[PDB]
Write a protein that binds this ligand. Structure first.
Ligand SMILES: O=c1ccn([C@H]2C[C@H](O)[C@@H](COP(=O)(O)NP(=O)(O)OP(=O)(O)O)O2)c(=O)[nH]1
Ligand SMILES: [Cl-]
Ligand SMILES: [Cl-]
Ligand SMILES: [Cl-]
Ligand SMILES: [Cl-]
Ligand SMILES: [Cl-]
Ligand SMILES: [Mg+2]
Ligand SMILES: [Mg+2]
Ligand code: NA
Ligand code: NA
Length: 326
DNA sequence: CCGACAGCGCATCAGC
DNA sequence: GCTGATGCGA
DNA sequence: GTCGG
């Protein structure tokens, strides 16, 4: 939080470019800068100082000087006063409503939480659940609760088949004291890059979690990725816990390490690592790390037996999960 | 300058 | 029904 | 918006 003021500004700018301008690259440019500045171990005294960092160019350097001097950014001050921008930014906060649907809804006069509620009919399934739990999905999950949730998930999974391995990844695995949601990497020996000897592997787990009333709603669901909602059980006379978002990813067991690396993130860390990979001549996804031929075409999967092996291929020293929070 | 910017699963749609 | 483009989110 | 060649 040394440069909290500056990172918030850059984040707001990023959200504006993504939600309103629908300019994704500007979105990522701003996020990269906020990220590199978030880890800068000094209290930034000037844009020039910030420009030293990779990701911070002339435009952001100027904005930082304006922020350090006045404590604000006129450009943002103006964005905040624009109704269309305010409405669009707001609507995108509903899970399932992106920049397009948000701008679309505004054209139709649907601009507030109140409007969304009297217009459920105009929403798809995902947007409907997002609206339903709008408030809850805003709340962070104390790690203490993450521990309880982990307990339930691992124990319920074990009950379906002792051969399943469920690993909580995301910010939890990185040691965060609070998480935005719970991310679970799932594996089962029957499902490998070689074959799927058992269908419904993801379904069965979802089913079991719904049975014990842990999973309450489903945003989306396929053979390998589940996007849903869950809730910790509460005691008698005790107020109910907020509903939580839960993501589950079923990955071939022989590709666990590439899968655990991906799902542990962060997303910016993954973006930096994959980009670095390309430069070194490799391509990395959640399943494998492949070399890039002279043509650019990816080759065959390289042997991987630990997260570290992936780091070695691209000539990167190993970084513990707790240090991948970019 | 100018092309590149990480990679991909699920939902939904147009075109056939 | 299929396939491919697009939105959305991870 | 920023970067590398
Ligand atoms: O754009 C994305 C989003 C997510 N991911 C990966 C990394 C991230 O850590 C993981 C889980 O996604 P979340 O959106 O749940 N983020 P995370 O768990 O890191 O943080 P939070 O506490 O917000 O959930 O998926 C990407 O690679 N790219
Ligand atoms: Cl852009
Ligand atoms: Cl401001
Ligand atoms: Cl692997
Ligand atoms: Cl692959
Ligand atoms: Cl995912
Ligand atoms: Mg998460
Ligand atoms: Mg998640
Ligand atoms: Na710089
Ligand atoms: Na949204």
């Amino acid at each position: 939080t040394l440069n909290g003021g500056i990172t918030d500004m850059l984040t707001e700018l990023a959200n504006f470019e993504k939600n309103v301008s629908q300019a994704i690259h500007k979105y990522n440019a701003y996020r990269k800068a906020a990220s590199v500045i978030a880890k800068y171990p000094h209290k930034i005294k000037s844009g020039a100082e910030a420009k030293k960092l990779p990701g911070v160019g002339t435009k952001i350097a100027e904005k930082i000087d304006e922020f350090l001097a006045t404590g604000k950014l006129r450009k943002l001050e103006k964005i905040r006063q624009d109704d269309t921008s305010s409405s669009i930014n707001f609507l995108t906060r509903v899970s399932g409503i992106g920049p397009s649907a948000a701008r679309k809804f505004v054209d139709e006069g649907i601009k507030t939480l109140e409007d969304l509620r009297k217009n459920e009919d105009k929403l798809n399934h995902h947007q409907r659940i997002g609206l339903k739990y709008f408030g809850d999905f805003e709340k962070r999950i104390p790690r203490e609760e993450m521990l309880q949730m982990q307990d339930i998930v691992l124990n319920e999974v074990k009950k379906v088949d002792s051969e399943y391995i469920a690993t909580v990844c995301g910010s939890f695995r990185r040691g965060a004291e609070s998480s935005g949601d719970m991310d679970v990497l799932l594996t089962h020996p029957s499902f490998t890059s070689e074959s799927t000897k058992q269908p419904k592997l993801l379904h069965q787990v979802v089913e079991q979690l719904q049975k014990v009333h842990f999973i309450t709603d489903t945003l989306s669901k396929g053979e390998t990725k589940f996007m849903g909602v869950c809730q910790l059980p509460s005691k008698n006379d005790e107020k109910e816990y907020p509903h939580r978002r839960i993501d589950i990813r079923l990955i071939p067991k022989d590709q666990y390490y590439c899968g655990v690396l991906y799902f542990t993130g962060s997303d910016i860390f993954n973006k930096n690592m994959r980009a670095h990979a390309l430069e070194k001549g490799f391509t990395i996804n959640e399943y494998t790390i492949r070399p890039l031929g002279v043509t650019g075409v990816a080759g065959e999967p390289l042997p991987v037996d630990s997260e570290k092996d992936i780091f070695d291929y691209i000539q990167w020293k190993y970084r513990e999960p707790k240090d991948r929070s970019e």
